[PDB]
Symmetry: D2
Subunit: 360 residues, 4 copies
């Protein structure tokens, strides 16, 4: 598997796995990494929704930054200041829970520019991204004010770009040859969108969460990579949750996109490559989910899980797994009263040994 | 290792690893699980500070709940209803980032009681935990209101119980024979505290984060299990961050508790079992930190990483590693406008087959 | 998922994962654990073929024990002396390379009984299981003789029970309620067999490796659990090994059982539960294979991977995943070969060991 | 950590982890990977002893290839044809258990040369490497004879280079400016050795298994990288095994090199970098072993676990961890043994396979 090795001391070419930080990105290539793929229950195997997109022009975007996804995003060996632009499909903790982590960790990790967040409005002020993010910064006001005494507060700003959720396939971002469009989703309440990324003849669709809708099939048409919610089966709902027959059946019709509905949508969409995500990707769930899609869609399919990567080139959309470090590292008025400062323990004795040795 | 197997068809007793959900807890026993141990930066290997405490009387506590920890907590096979009481040491993202996941996750996962949070105050209203939590709920208003359409709101609420950060060893909690005390830390700015749980002759101390202070040694004295911050070497600061000598030296004296200061501190306390946490616990970092602690302390010492467990009994404080599921599961006015509900797609034909088989 | 918790202090019943050593086995119950499932190349995610069978009467059997599988077997918290009976389908290293590790490791782990091995003959002495084990013990003569000096050598013996590979469903083991029968496979050359284990109304079938054959569908009929070979697609063969199309086609027709053939077989067999194994179980292989299978078979299916487990009860065959320790340890159950030339090289380390020795001796 | 990233679209330089297959090896550089580091009992976290050595002149070696290590070796994306030369310290299953897997595996993975094995003689013919490998090939005769019907048999040969175990720091190998030398160990019975590899101004020492001896401290002197056995404490022996106090004591003195002894040895050697291995590398074991060493040795020190790697340059010896695929694959670089009796048993599967077959053929 992978490219043929041509020398003892050389580099293995077109490696069968993606090692993050190890591969040059071509000027007509997109890299998409799933840094989170699993619904609202927390689990080490699948963080909540998060996508990192690297474009051959040097631009990088995050779409969704769900609870737990930062551990994956930090494993990519991308400097913080290259990852400042974040698009939110909607305000479920499982789609922006780890914004606080990117904001706080990313700042310690050496980001020098503000975060730029694009997110939907809701049906009223207090149901949109602008309200949400302003209250998140106040929530973490003790973190912000204590950090800023010692680090210039510029990287701690969040420039929110709130776009109308109601808009049908309109531009929300246009810069340096890159366009994002939003259209609505049907999910929990008014606000959630899907995004389409267009650049250099490539189209990547980030479906977010939704029950099936008439917009995604129309506006996602002929995507290189189409990502859509794809729910576990009703049988699995009963087995895993103790759900009645009634509630279990209702969930795959009104609340979530069934695997079979996902099939229908990708049959309509005709993408180069479809990606099902949101479900628990386990040895006893994945197969009946896959069979559901296959009733209705026959074309190229990935069943998303954490750290799956797609390379989009003119000739191919190639699925691989990313092999990254679990033991990840970053790659490159006082708020104290005299009362607290007075409580410092003397430790000059215990430290004098290591201390003298280090200063030569 | 472990106890002697006695039958072919039996159960291994006194197992050398802790399997969460597999062991009855004794009426005179405590269980502490590190659900996060590793600070500023995210990494799959170490979530941010979180501690689960199980008492033999049946009360369960969480002390800190940092970004990432929810995936560890959910691998314990504990129902949502039994984890409702959370204690924060401070308002750093890496000690309450996942409170939102516990909040939103537990509520979709059958929890029937609100969360209860105890955390300190700051030098002023916008620097304490009552401000923090109020603004977190506003930040997640879209999630709050959308969820409340389909699930009684009472679990969504968060009874906060702010207490003065300046107090020197004062009860902040007392129900069902359990007592928590707090006292100050010297960390980033005014507000951060350490806790001491006293129950049924047992004392467990959670140091949160701090530079070495005079209150910890005095109020921690004779704990069964004593947890305190312990940091990377100055040499490791220079190698991992390219910090110059001056800044590297000073971070181990002014800003954080050195390995050697950790030792001095635990010598004064003389606990049954000391725990060092907060450092990145890697094959090249951990070793020199242990040689630091052992310059000044010779009693029983754990170097925490995630899913490390302590059984506190009358006889012993015993460290094991927990071996828990990566593929974890939960164990047991509308906010839509007609503009959105008008976009629902017809999937009836796509879904007819599985529907018909599922009804028979 | 799993059973409802009904106390803060208590045990979570009927767990959604198997924690090895944590569950009582019922008298009318079988536990089968996959301790390897993977093709002829090594990888940490899949050891080479290995099955542990636990019967409710307290009998335990290893069927196949390929390279890598011992790390999985040793994670089950089963004492070495309970795992003394081993059945080999065939003499590929991926089916018995770890017998050496069970022999040596299991002994230091506290086996006190000799190992017992059942395996086919071949077309001549030197192609059979007796020859192979006999010469495996000679290969490890240095380990054996050095170990045996001061110790009872009884646990180092391997008693081989060789049986005629050509026999059509004949008994090869009959002890304490338990029957094993074997029948041929078609695979590399004469010798490889499949096994049926019959006990207390249950029938577990271990296919080993084969091209599709007329025996397996006859003698596996009605198995509670039927394990059979199932191969990567020809397309996967061309992607992963740059096979020309001609050879890739033939690999799935002549040498191995295809997913579609596997489907034809389990349709014919009609078990309570079919297991597919012996393929690399990856995010980009597994789906095409499940599809191939479902063309022809509609009944309960497991796609095996390392540490998958089935509970066979009267009422269900239940698949779970085992969650076991990676930092495993053995669990307890109930003429010198030195010259003076080598022993005169011992380094004086009294000084260096003084401090720890004194503390330890009180 | 790591080199400064200079470009959005470019490669992270001097990565803080080693991704096997992602780095050019310099002409005056050595890379050493631990592919097994673990005690005598099997576990997923730690294979039995195996070291992969890559030199900047293109030569590659394996020193030891204990049970389980092939999974780690196969994760390095090194073609089978570059990994044909194997050095064994001694004939414990934990130091050559996976020779069979490399032999069979690398032959299907496409090796086109014979394996070349260097190993020690014993006090008599049946205690040496030549006798061991001979009987290993007879053991796996069914695998060899069946494989040889469809693949050229040349790469199925193992050329054994047996060397005098008794020799004191003599050459066992000299080729292309690369030397290996051997000297005795004190371990189980006569036969075990340590190696030193000398090339282009560099010296790398592979200790094997030994109680403290007078030869390692003398011949390992001034090594760039010095590897030596280093055991778990007597307290840990008592806890993990329930050894009675006096047995636990003797194990750290007569049978195995204690942490303190290792310290004395490395204090005498003065290597650029020392490596302790063979102990179960756990949260409740590793720290007291490290303490023990630091009683007697203060220089640079690695506590080996699986997939740790050392880069050796003129400037430095750098420890990192290797991050490699669990889901590994190969990377590319006579009479039949069937009787008609077996071949007559083929199943008709023409119908089940017609659909995929027609589609695949265009
Ligand atoms: Zn959502
Ligand atoms: Zn803090
Ligand atoms: Zn075979
Ligand atoms: Zn040995």
């Amino acid at each position: 598997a992978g490219g043929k090795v041509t020398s003892s001391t050389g580099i293995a070419p077109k490696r069968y796995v993606y090692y993050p930080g190890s591969e040059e990105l071509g000027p007509d290539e997109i890299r998409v990494i799933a840094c989170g793929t699993g619904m609202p229950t927390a689990r080490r195997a699948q963080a909540a929704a998060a996508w990192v997109v690297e474009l051959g022009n040097g631009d990088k975007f995050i779409v969704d930054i769900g609870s737990g996804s930062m551990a994956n995003i930090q494993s990519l060996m991308i400097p913080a200041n290259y990852l400042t632009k974040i698009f939110l499909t909607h305000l479920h903790t499982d789609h922006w829970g780890d914004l606080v982590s990117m904001w706080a960790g990313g700042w310690t990790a050496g980001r020098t520019d503000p975060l730029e967040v694009w997110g939907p409005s809701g049906s009223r002020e207090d149901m949109g991204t602008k309200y949400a993010v302003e209250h998140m910064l106040k929530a973490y006001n003790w973190d912000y004010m204590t950090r800023a005494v010692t680090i210039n507060p510029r990287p701690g700003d969040i420039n929110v770009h709130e776009f109308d959720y109601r808009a049908l396939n309109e531009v929300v971002y246009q810069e340096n040859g890159v366009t994002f469009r939003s259209w609505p989703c049907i999910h929990a309440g008014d606000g959630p969108v899907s995004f389409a990324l267009e650049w250099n003849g490539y189209k990547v669709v980030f479906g977010g969460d939704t029950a099936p809708n008439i917009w995604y099939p129309e506006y996602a048409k002929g995507a290189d990579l189409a990502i859509h919610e794809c729910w576990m089966t009703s049988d699995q709902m009963m087995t895993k949750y103790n759900q009645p027959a009634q509630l279990a059946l209702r969930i795959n019709l009104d609340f979530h996109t069934s695997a079979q509905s996902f099939g229908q949508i990708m049959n309509m969409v005709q993408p180069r490559h479809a990606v099902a995500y949101a479900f628990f990707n386990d040895d006893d769930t994945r197969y009946d989910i896959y069979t559901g899609v296959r009733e209705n869609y026959a074309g190229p399919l990935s069943m998303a899980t954490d750290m799956m990567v797609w390379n989009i080139t003119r000739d191919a959309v190639t699925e691989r797994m990313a092999v990254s470090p679990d033991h990840a590292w970053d790659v490159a008025a006082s708020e104290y009263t005299q009362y607290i400062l007075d409580g410092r323990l003397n430790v000059d004795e215990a430290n004098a040994h290591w201390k003298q040795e280090f200063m030569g």
